[PDB]
Write a protein that binds this ligand. Structure first.
Ligand SMILES: [Zn+2]
Ligand SMILES: [Zn+2]
Length: 61
């Protein structure tokens, strides 16, 4: 079954669509700029990189 916005929202702030995701086993959840900085506030996880969830169209006509 496909996911929903009621389960793929931010899991810490639930105030944004969770536009990013963290691939490490200590995050493994969706985040926004706010809750991303809450799981990466310390220097120990600064090696993580956010995955995208949306992109621009290949046309602008
Ligand atoms: Zn992370
Ligand atoms: Zn968030």
């Amino acid at each position: 079954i496909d996911p929903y916005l009621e389960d793929s929202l931010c899991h810490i702030c639930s105030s944004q669509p969770g536009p990013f995701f963290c691939r490490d086993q200590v995050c493994f959840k969706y985040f926004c700029r706010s809750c991303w900085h809450w799981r990466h506030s310390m220097e120990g996880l600064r090696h993580h990189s956010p995955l995208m969830r949306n992109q621009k169209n290949r046309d602008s006509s």
